[PDB]
Every structure is written in structure tokens, then in C-alpha cells.
């Protein structure tokens, strides 16, 4: 089996910059190398085949070069919509094999998040549970820390955080932090607070709601 090794495992670049992705074969594969782009929630799309042939419909900014065991995919001027995982594959020898991929992320200006907090729905309370959600929207960079306070006391148990992939237009991230409690626990306290610390602000961004009105 021929092993395909993709160099940059991960990479971040700004819109308009030229980027080069590398793919090496453990042994000769001639020019039988193809490159694929896989955007979030989509199947792979063929970009280049035969090492340097651009597939029909592919934008001119994508070009390929190489032979034998060293291949490269070049993006002349990266676009925000180029955010994706890129894979090379060889079809010179059997079985066909693919490299492990290179993830291309976009760099952009720092942006402070917008915060929203949501009390549990009456529907959930009926089942005996209560999830309080804090949503941080459209920010950059990805790194952010969320702290939960109940009636002024920090709560670290029962918290679940998750991020969205980077937006294909604005290159910003979004993330939700979910605090889950039982109905009894939720009803014995009044103030629920979400505190977010991001590099854009020295002081944390706080969002809270009082059960005796929401």
C-alpha cells in the first residue's frame, strides 16, 4: 500500500494570500494524484486530477503541480469560502489510497461576541429537567471561556460547551454553553449568570436573567 502524507496538518491564512498544500507519496505514483475539497457537512469535491489538470467548473485560483513523490496544491488567492479540509489521493497502484487531509482555516480581525441567554422551556420543566443556554455569537478568535453562576455562586458541574465551524462568509465562530439541572434545583434559585472572557475585552461579558420575571 502506498502511503500519502499531507504536510501541513492544519493551517490558517488571510483572505487574498497564496497558500500551498503539500502531499508526499511513500513511493512513485507518477502523475496519478488527485486533490479533493470537503467543506463542512458536504461530500468531497474533485478539484485537480492527473496532478495538474483542473476539473470542469473549478475556479482558476486552484492549480496543481508535481510528479513521482512530491505534489502540491496551490490556491493563488484564498477566499473565505475556501474554508475546508483538503485531501490528495493516488490511483497509480492498487489499492487506491488517500492522505489524511489538511484543514484550512481563515484568519481575520478580532471580533467581540454577542451574548444571549435562554431560560428553560416550560416543556422541559414538565419532564423534570432544566437546561439553561448561553449563546456566544460571531466572534474571533475561536478561544473563549465561559463561567456559570447561580445566585452568585460558581457552578462547574453539568456544563456542556460546543462550537460551530467557522462561518464561510465572515469567518467568525459561535458557541453555546449549556447548564443542565433538575427542575427542583432550578426552582430553588433566582439568578442565572453567564460570564464570558474573550481576548477582545479585559473585563468579562456578562449576561443574566432572574427567574422571578423570566
Amino acid at each position: 500500500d502506498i502511503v500519502m502524507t499531507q504536510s501541513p496538518k492544519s493551517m490558517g491564512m488571510s483572505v487574498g494570500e497564496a497558500v500551498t498544500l503539500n502531499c508526499k507519496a511513500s513511493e512513485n505514483v507518477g502523475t496519478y494524484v488527485s486533490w479533493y475539497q470537503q467543506k463542512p457537512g458536504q461530500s468531497p469535491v474533485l478539484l485537480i486530477y492527473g496532478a495538474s489538470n483542473r476539473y470542469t467548473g473549478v475556479p482558476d485560483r486552484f492549480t496543481g503541480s508535481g510528479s513521482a513523490t512530491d505534489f502540491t496544491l496551490t490556491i493563488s488567492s484564498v477566499q473565505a469560502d475556501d474554508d475546508a479540509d483538503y485531501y490528495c489521493g493516488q490511483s497509480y497502484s492498487s489499492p487506491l489510497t488517500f492522505g489524511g487531509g489538511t484543514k484550512l482555516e481563515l484568519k481575520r480581525a478580532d471580533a467581540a461576541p454577542t451574548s444571549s441567554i435562554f431560560p428553560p422551556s416550560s416543556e422541559q420543566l414538565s419532564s423534570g429537567g432544566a437546561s439553561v443556554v448561553c449563546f456566544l455569537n460571531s466572534f474571533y478568535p475561536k478561544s473563549i471561556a465561559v463561567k456559570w453562576k447561580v445566585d452568585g455562586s460558581k457552578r462547574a458541574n453539568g456544563t456542556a460547551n460546543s462550537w460551530t465551524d467557522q462561518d464561510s462568509a465572515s469567518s467568525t465562530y459561535s458557541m453555546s454553553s449549556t447548564l443542565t439541572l433538575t427542575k427542583d434545583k432550578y426552582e430553588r434559585h433566582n439568578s442565572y449568570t453567564c460570564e464570558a472572557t474573550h481576548k477582545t475585552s479585559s473585563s468579562p461579558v456578562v449576561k443574566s436573567f432572574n427567574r422571578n420575571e423570566c
Binding site: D1, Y32, S34, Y36, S43, P44, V45, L46, Y49, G50, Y55, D85, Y87, G89, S91, S94, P95, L96, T97, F98, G100, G101, T114, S116, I117, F118, P119, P120, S121, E123, Q124, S127, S131, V133, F135, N137, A160, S162, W163, T164, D165, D167, S174, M175, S176, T178, F209, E213, C214
Partner: protein, 217 residues
């Protein structure tokens, strides 16, 4: 041009056999080209499994040859993959594709989870602002989907009409069930006036839920 669509069980128990179907439209599988099956593991690494050519000849990866079978039905224009004695390691997204040395056409892919656990439908709860939001301009609504197994779940807004400003965080596994949240930001002069609903589908359990987001009062 050609269109491929995979179909099959989203959940199979270990030791059982896995059968997937690929339905091809706008191209006869007897005309030309090789018809392949390729899978992508959770880690995103890809593996070519094999193909059946337009002439009926099959070719398999070495590593699966003893447990795999690819067949076709020329009258229905479909080709199939059968993988015997599956283990948890066979959990992956399975794709059918057309190609020889390159693959220009891929199906959408079907996720197969190999597990002994049983299917569990979603509970969908609305996410409505605590009203204490005097920001006017923009309003963020949402749907919390929790306690389901296995993946995946599909979440759409307004039948799919509302596609801008939609943010769906990745699923998270806790104990043995998944949870996910989808949020949408709309112009403040659109929600209080127009209805916003989230459509949630969980294939594995053949569940389709509809949730209206009612104003806070």
C-alpha cells in the same frame, strides 16, 4: 449530470451484516465507468473499499476482500455493498462514487453506526429570549435537540426558507446520548410578526418533529 444516492440502516449491531444501496440517476451503470464504495471514518481518514465496473467486474481492497461483496441490479440501476461481520471499527460515513483514477461524482453519504445500544428519539425544546433583551435590531431564537442516539439529526428553519444567520453547534456525546443546539438570528421586525419554526428529523428512529417558537410573555 449523474446523481448518486446512498441508502441503508443508520444503526447495525456488531456481528451482523451491513447492506447499503446506491441509486444512480441520469446515467446507466452499464454504459461506462467504475462504480465505487468509499468510507470515511470518524477521524476523517478515507478508505476505498472496491467497485463494480460497467461490465460487471469487481475489484476490492485487499484488506476487505474476504468479507465484502459488491453487486448490482441493472434493471433498477442500483449497485450494492454487503459487509459481513461488522465490528465497532466499521462505524463510518459510507459513500458511493463514480470514477477510475479520480472521483468526480460522489453521493451525499450515509452514516452507519455499529453499536449494541438502541435507537432513542430527540427531545426538542424551544430557546426563546428572556424578554429582557432590549436590543431590538437583532433577535436570536433556537431549538435544543437532546437525548438522541445514534447520529445524525437534521435541523432546518422554516422548512428551509430561513438559511441565513443559522448557527448549528457540533453534537456532543455525554454518557451515551447526543445533544445539539441550532440558533438563528433574524431581523427584530420579522419574528414577533412572522412565525419561526425549526424542523428536526432523526432518520434512525424515523422521527420528524416540528416546533413553533412562541414569543416570551
Amino acid at each position: 449530470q449523474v446523481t448518486l444516492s446512498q441508502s441503508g440502516p443508520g444503526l447495525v449491531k456488531p456481528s451482523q451484516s451491513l447492506s447499503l444501496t446506491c441509486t444512480v440517476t441520469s446515467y446507466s451503470i452499464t454504459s461506462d465507468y467504475a462504480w465505487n464504495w468509499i468510507r470515511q471514518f470518524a477521524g476523517q481518514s478515507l478508505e476505498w473499499m472496491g467497485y463494480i465496473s460497467y461490465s460487471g467486474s469487481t475489484s476490492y481492497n485487499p484488506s476487505l476482500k474476504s468479507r465484502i461483496s459488491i453487486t448490482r441490479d441493472t434493471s433498477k440501476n442500483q449497485f450494492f455493498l454487503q459487509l459481513n461481520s461488522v465490528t465497532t471499527d466499521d462505524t463510518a460515513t459510507y459513500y458511493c462514487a463514480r470514477g477510475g483514477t479520480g472521483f468526480p461524482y460522489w453521493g451525499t453519504g450515509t452514516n452507519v453506526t455499529v453499536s449494541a445500544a438502541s435507537t432513542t428519539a430527540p427531545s426538542v425544546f424551544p430557546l426563546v429570549p428572556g424578554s429582557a433583551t432590549a436590543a431590538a435590531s437583532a433577535v436570536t431564537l433556537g431549538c435544543l435537540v437532546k437525548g438522541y442516539f445514534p447520529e445524525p439529526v437534521t435541523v432546518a428553519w422554516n422548512e428551509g426558507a430561513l438559511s441565513s444567520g443559522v448557527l448549528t453547534v457540533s453534537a456532543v456525546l455525554q454518557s451515551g446520548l447526543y445533544t445539539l443546539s441550532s440558533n438563528t438570528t433574524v431581523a427584530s421586525g420579522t419574528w414577533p410578526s412572522a412565525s419561526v419554526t425549526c424542523l428536526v428529523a432523526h432518520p434512525k428512529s424515523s422521527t420528524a418533529a416540528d416546533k413553533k417558537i412562541e414569543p416570551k410573555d
